[PDB]
Design a protein around this ligand. Structure first.
Ligand SMILES: [K+]
Lengths: 953, 72
C-alpha cells in the first residue's frame, strides 16, 4: 500500500511500533488502547511522541532522541526525493518535522515535560556533540522566535550553560578544547539570530547580583565563563609550560605560537558574539556598557601594591575584555581621525553614569573642584551616553585596571621566583628526626614547590601573551589614537590633528605656583582621571621590554610621542611628577641607541614631527629643573634627570637642529639655560660622593653578612639587611650613572659653547666642582674602592675622569676659567693633573698623547696664573682683603653690611650707589640706605690696622 | 468541548466553550483538580499555551488530549 509506506516510515523515524514484537531495537508502545490501532499515519504522530516523552520508558536522553528523530527525518527526505513516489510521503515528513521541532522547543522551555533528564543533561548532550544538534537547534530557535517565546528558551539554555561550565566540568578553560569551542558555537548559533541578539541581555543572571564578589563575575554571570577563556589562566599555563619549564627558547616559542594562534580565534569569536549584542538594540548595547562598567568598578585593587587576587577578577578575564573594548574603539580612531569628534570631550563635565569615579585622582584638580565643576555644569538629567564615548573611556579604564593589573602581576614574578627558590633551598636543609615534623616539613616544601611551578608557568604564559604582537598592536594603536584625542581636548581650538596645536598654552613662567598652574590648567582636561594617562604609560614602559613590542617601528607612535611632549612642555596639564617621570623615562627608551648603534626608535619622530621638534628640547631643560620641588619615591628627580640626560645627549649627537636649539637657548635665553646648568652643576657637587658612600654601605652590609661567628655589630633582621643591601645598590647606580651623564653633558656642551660656562654665576662654582671631582677620581676616594663588577652600578671612574678632564680642556682658553681654577685654594694642585694623566694612560687608547699634552698645557697655565697671583699679593697686597671696599678697591672708612647680599661695603659707596639705583648692587634686591647695618667690629679692625701702619713707616 | 488532561498516569476531563480563552481553561482546572493559578503549564499539539489566547484559537478538538505540567 501507500498508507502502509507511510505507517512504516514513521516506525523507522521515531523508532517505535505498536503490536510489534520483533526485529529492530524499537520500543513497543505501552499500553494505550486508542494508539493500539494497527493502522498508523500522520495523526498518531503527536501521540507517539507524547508517549515517547511523557509516559517515558527507559527513554533516558529525550532531547537526543528528538534530535535523532530530526536527522532521521532529514535523511529520509533525501532518500525519498529521488525515488518512485516522493510526493505521497510528503505529508508524513512534514508532520514529523512540525512536531519534533515543536517538542524540542518544549523540552527546552519547561523543566518537567519529560521525566527523564532535565536542562543540564540536555545541554550536556548538546555541548558534547554540538555539530549534530546544530540544524535541529537552529530550527528550535526559529520556532521559538515565531511563537513569541524566545526569552523562555534563552532562560532555559543560557543559565543552564552557566551551571554546566562551573559545575559539570572541573575547569572551564582553554585546556578543554572540544568543550569551550562547542560552547562558543552555541553562543554564535543563538546570537546570530537578530531577535535573540536584541533581548540577550535580559537573560536571568546576565548581570551580577548585588552580592556577587568580583572573582565570581566570570563565574556567575551569563558571559563570564567564555569571557575568561585565555592562555594566562593558571591551569592553562601549568598544562602548557609547567609541563617542562626547562625547554629551549625554540621549544618555548612553539608553545607561545600555538597559544597565540588559539587566543586570536577566541578573541575573534568573543568579539563576534559581543558585537552581535551591541548591534541588537540600544538596550543590549547599553547593558553591555553597564556590564563591563560594573566589572571595572569593582576591580580597582587590581592596581594596588599587594592585590587581594582571590577577591578580584582574573587576568585572562580582564585582559580579554580590554581587547574587546579596544576593538569597539578602533573604528572611530582610524588614522584619518575623521570620526574623532564622535567622542565627547565633555564626558566628565557631568556626574558619570557608568564608570565610578569616586576616589579617582584627576590630572590637575582635586575632589572639591571636580564636584564643584559638576554643579556649574552637569547636563540636564536624561541628556546622556553616546555608546562611542562610553566605550572609549571604558577602554581606558580597562587598559589600566585590566591589562595594567596583568602586567604588574607579571613584572613582580622574577623576584617572587628567586625568593621562593631561596625558601625552598633553606627548608630543604632541615633534618627532621620526628615523624610528625618530617611530614609537616615535606608538606611545607611541597606547597612552596607548587606555588613555584604555578608562578614559573604563569610567567611563561604572560610572556606569551605580551609578546603576541598582533594583539598588542591593537592595544598600542588604541593608545596612539587616545593620544591624538587627548591632544584635541587640550587644544583651545579643539581642532587637532586637523590643525597644529600651538604650544605653550600659557606663557613660560620665570616658587609654589602649583595653585597658579592649577588655576590656568585647561578645562575640561584638568578634570580627566589620571588613569587616562597612567594606563598608556604603564603599558608602554612595560611593553618595551619585548623584542616583538608593538611600539617598535609603529607608524602611529608619533601621536603618543606628541602627547608626551605636550605634557612635558606644559606643566599645568599633569601635576603628578611621578607620572611625568614615567613619561620622560619612556622618551629615554626611544632615545637609546640600538645594539648596532643606529639611532633609537623615536629619533626619527624627534627630528621630523613639527610638534615635537618645536617643543622637546625646552620641555626637557625645563623639566630637569622643576623636578626639584619634591619630585623617597622612585621616579626620583635623579632618575628623571638620568632619563633626560640620555635624551639630551643623543639629540645632540644625531640631530643638528637640536644642537642648534641648545646653542640658541644658551645664547638667546641664557637665564633659562643657566638655571638648568646650575642644577646640573650643583648635583655634581655631591653625586659621586653619594655613589662612593652607598658602595661603602654595600660593603659594611656585606661584611656583616659574612660574620658567621657574629657580633652582631646590629645585624637587625637578615632580610632588612638584604633590603638595605638592594637599596644601597640602587642608590649607588643611580648616583654614579647620573654623574656620568652630567659630566658627559658638560663635556659636549663646553666643546661648543665654552662661553656659557664662564659667566660669573657658574664659573667659580664650576671650577670648584670640577676640582673636587678631580680629587676623588685621582685620590683614595675612588682609589680604595673595590666592588665586584662595578659596571653593575654604572661605576666607571675612568670614563668619568676622561670626561672631567675634557671639560678642563674645552674651557682652557677662557681666561675667567683659567683664573677661577687658579684661585680655588680648596682643591687646586697641579699634581692632580699629573695623577690624572697617570691614571688615564692606564686604559690604553683612553687618552691620545695629544689629549695629554693639552691637559698638561692647561695645568701649567693655571699653575702659572696662581704664581702671578701669589707674587702680586706678596709685592702689592699691603692691605688685608676684608678691609677693602668691594667696589672702590680702597680701605673702607665706615663698613656697613648689606642685608640681602651680606656684603660689606663702605657707607659712602652704598650711598653713591643708592643715589642712582635703589638696589643691593650685588644681587639686585630692593634696598633703602636706612636698612644698612654698621660693622662696628670690622671698623675697629681697620682702625687698629691703620694705627699699626701710621706708627712705624 | 470534551478534552482529556493527561500526565502519564492522571486525567481530569473538562468542558469549556471554544471561544473562551486559555486563562479560563487554567481556572477551569485550578478548582477542579488541586493545582494553583500560576502552577499550571499546558502543552498541546507541539506548542505551549498562553493565558490570553482562546482554546479555539489553538483549534483544540472534542475527544482530544492536552497535556499538563506541575510548575515549581
Ligand atoms: K595632521
Amino acid at each position: 500500500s501507500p498508507e502502509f509506506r507511510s505507517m512504516t516510515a514513521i516506525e523507522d523515524i521515531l523508532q517505535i511500533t505498536t503490536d510489534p514484537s520483533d526485529t529492530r531495537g524499537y520500543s513497543l508502545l505501552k499500553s494505550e488502547e486508542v494508539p493500539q490501532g494497527s493502522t498508523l499515519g500522520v495523526d498518531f504522530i503527536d501521540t507517539l511522541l507524547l508517549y515517547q516523552l511523557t509516559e517515558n520508558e527507559k527513554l533516558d536522553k529525550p532531547f537526543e532522541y528528538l534530535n535523532d528523530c530530526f536527522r532521521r527525518n532529514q535523511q529520509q527526505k533525501r532518500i525519498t526525493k529521488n525515488k518512485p513516489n516522493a510526493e505521497s510521503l510528503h505529508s508524513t515528513f512534514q508532520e514529523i518535522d512540525r512536531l519534533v521541532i515543536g517538542y524540542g522547543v518544549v523540552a527546552l522551555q519547561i523543566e518537567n515535560f519529560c521525566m527523564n533528564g532535565a536542562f543540564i543533561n540536555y545541554i550536556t548532550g548538546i555541548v558534547s556533540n554540538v555539530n549534530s544538534y546544530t540544524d535541529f537547534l537552529s530550527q528550535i530557535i526559529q520556532r521559538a522566535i515565531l511563537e513569541g517565546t524566545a526569552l523562555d528558551l534563552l532562560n532555559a539554555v543560557f543559565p543552564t550553560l552557566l551551571e554546566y561550565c562551573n559545575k559539570h566540568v572541573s575547569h572551564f578553560d582553554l585546556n578543554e578544547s572540544v568543550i569551550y569551542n562547542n560552547v562558543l558555537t552555541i553562543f554564535e548559533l543563538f546570537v546570530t539570530f537578530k531577535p535573540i541578539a536584541e533581548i540577550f541581555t535580559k537573560i536571568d543572571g546576565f548581570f551580577a547580583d548585588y552580592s556577587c564578589k568580583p572573582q565570581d563575575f566570570e563565574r556567575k554571570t551569563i558571559l563570564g565563563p567564555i569571557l575568561s577563556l585565555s592562555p594566562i589562566e593558571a591551569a592553562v599555563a601549568i598544562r602548557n609550560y609547567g609541563d617542562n619549564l626547562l625547554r629551549s627558547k625554540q621549544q618555548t616559542a612553539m608553545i607561545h605560537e600555538s597559544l597565540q594562534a588559539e587566543h586570536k580565534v577566541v578573541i575573534d569569536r568573543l568579539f563576534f558574539i559581543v558585537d552581535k549584542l551591541v548591534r541588537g538594540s540600544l538596550n543590549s548595547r547599553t547593558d553591555m556598557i553597564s556590564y563591563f562598567a560594573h566589572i571595572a568598578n569593582k576591580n580597582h585593587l587590581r592596581r594596588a601594591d599587594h592585590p587581594p587576587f582571590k577577591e578580584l577578577s582574573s587576568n585572562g578575564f580582564m585582559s580579554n575584555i580590554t581587547l574587546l573594548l579596544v576593538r569597539f574603539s578602533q573604528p572611530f580612531l582610524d588614522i584619518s581621525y575623521k570620526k574623532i569628534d564622535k567622542i565627547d570631550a565633555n564626558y566628565f563635565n557631568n556626574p558619570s553614569l557608568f564608570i565610578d569615579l569616586s576616589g579617582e585622582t584627576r590630572l590637575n584638580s582635586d575632589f572639591k573642584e571636580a564636584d564643584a565643576f559638576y554643579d556649574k555644569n552637569r547636563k540636564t538629567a536624561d541628556s546622556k551616553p553616546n555608546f562611542i564615548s562610553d566605550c572609549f573611556f571604558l577602554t581606558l579604564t580597562y587598559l589600566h585596571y585590566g591589562l595594567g593589573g596583568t602586567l604588574s602581576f607579571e613584572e613582580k614574578m622574577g623576584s617572587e621566583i628567586k625568593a621562593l627558590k631561596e625558601e625552598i633551598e633553606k627548608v630543604k636543609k632541615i633534618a627532621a628526626n620526628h615523624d610528625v615534623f618530617a611530614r609537616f616539613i615535606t608538606a611545607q616544601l611541597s606547597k612552596m614547590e607548587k606555588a613555584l611551578k604555578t608562578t614559573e608557568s604563569l610567567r611563561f604564559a604572560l610572556q606569551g601573551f605580551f609578546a603576541h604582537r598582533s594583539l598588542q598592536l591593537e592595544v598600542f594603536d588604541f593608545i596612539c589614537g587616545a593620544s591624538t584625542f587627548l591632544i584635541r581636548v587640550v587644544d583651545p581650538e579643539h581642532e587637532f590633528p586637523f590643525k597644529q596645536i600651538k604650544l605653550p598654552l600659557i606663557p613660560d613662567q620665570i616658587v609654589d605656583n602649583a595653585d597658579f598652574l592649577r588655576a590656568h590648567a585647561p578645562v575640561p582636561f584638568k578634570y580627566y582621571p589620571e588613569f587616562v594617562v597612567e594606563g598608556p604609560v604603564n603599558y608602554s614602559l612595560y611593553i618595551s621590554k619585548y623584542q616583538t613590542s608593538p611600539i617598535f617601528r609603529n607608524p602611529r607612535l608619533g601621536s603618543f610621542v606628541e602627547f608626551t611632549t605636550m605634557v612635558l612642555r606644559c606643566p599645568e596639564l599633569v601635576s603628578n611628577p611621578h607620572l611625568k617621570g614615567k613619561l620622560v623615562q619612556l622618551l629615554s627608551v626611544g632615545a637609546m641607541p640600538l645594539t648596532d648603534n643606529s639611532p633609537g626608535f623615536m629619533m626619527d619622530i624627534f627630528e621630523h614631527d613639527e610638534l615635537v621638534n618645536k617643543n622637546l628640547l625646552y620641555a626637557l631643560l625645563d623639566f630637569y629643573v622643576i623636578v626639584e620641588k619634591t619630585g623617597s619615591q622612585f621616579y626620583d628627580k635623579f632618575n628623571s634627570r638620568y632619563s633626560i640626560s640620555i635624551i639630551l645627549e643623543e639629540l645632540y649627537y644625531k640631530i643638528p637642529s637640536y644642537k642648534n636649539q641648545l646653542i640658541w637657548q644658551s645664547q638667546n635665553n641664557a637665564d633659562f639655560f643657566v638655571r638648568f646648568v646650575a642644577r646640573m652643576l650643583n648635583d655634581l657637587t655631591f653625586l659621586l660622593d653619594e655613589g662612593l658612600s652607598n658602595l661603602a654601605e654595600v660593603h659594611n652590609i656585606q661584611n656583616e653578612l659574612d660574620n658567621r661567628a657574629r657580633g652582631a655589630p646590629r645585624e637587625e633582621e637578615d632580610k632588612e639587611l638584604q633590603t638595605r643591601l638592594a637599596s644601597a645598590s640602587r642608590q649607588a647606580k643611580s648616583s654614579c650613572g647620573l654623574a656620568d651623564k652630567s659630566m658627559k653633558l658638560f663635556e659636549i656642551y663646553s666643546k661648543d659653547i665654552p662661553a656659557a660656562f664662564v659667566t660669573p654665576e657658574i664659573v667659580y662654582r664650576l671650577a670648584s666642582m670640577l676640582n673636587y671631582n678631580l680629587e676623588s677620581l685621582v685620590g683614595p676616594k675612588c682609589g680604595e674602592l673595590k666592588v665586584k663588577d662595578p659596571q653593575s652600578y654604572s661605576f666607571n671612574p675612568k670614563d668619568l675622569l676622561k670626561a672631567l678632564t675634557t671639560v678642563y680642556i674645552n674651557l682652557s682658553e677662557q681666561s675667567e676659567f683659567i683664573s677661577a681654577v687658579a684661585k680655588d685654594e680648596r682643591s687646586f694642585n697641579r699634581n692632580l693633573f699629573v695623577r690624572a694623566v697617570d691614571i688615564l694612560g692606564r686604559k690604553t687608547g683612553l687618552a691620545s698623547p695629544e689629549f695629554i699634552e693639552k691637559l698638561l698645557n692647561f695645568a701649567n697655565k693655571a699653575e702659572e696664573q696662581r704664581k702671578a697671583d701669589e707674587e702680586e699679593d706678596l709685592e702689592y697686597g699691603d692691605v688685608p682683603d676684608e678691609f677693602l671696599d668691594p667696589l672702590m678697591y680702597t680701605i673702607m672708612k665706615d663698613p656697613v653690611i648689606l642685608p640681602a647680599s651680606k656684603m660689606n661695603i663702605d657707607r659712602s659707596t652704598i650711598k653713591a650707589h643708592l643715589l642712582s639705583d635703589s638696589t643691593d648692587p650685588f644681587n639686585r634686591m630692593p634696598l633703602k640706605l636706612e636698612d644698612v647695618t654698621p660693622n662696628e667690629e670690622l671698623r675697629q679692625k681697620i682702625l687698629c690696622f691703620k694705627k699699626q701702619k701710621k706708627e712705624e713707616a | 468541548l470534551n478534552i482529556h488532561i493527561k500526565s502519564g498516569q492522571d486525567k481530569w476531563e473538562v468542558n469549556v466553550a471554544p471561544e473562551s480563552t486559555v486563562l479560563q481553561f487554567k481556572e477551569a482546572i485550578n478548582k477542579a483538580n488541586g493545582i494553583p493559578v500560576a502552577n499550571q503549564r499546558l502543552i498541546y499539539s507541539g506548542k505551549i499555551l498562553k493565558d490570553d489566547q482562546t482554546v479555539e484559537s489553538y483549534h483544540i478538538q472534542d475527544g482530544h488530549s492536552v497535556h499538563l505540567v506541575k510548575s515549581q
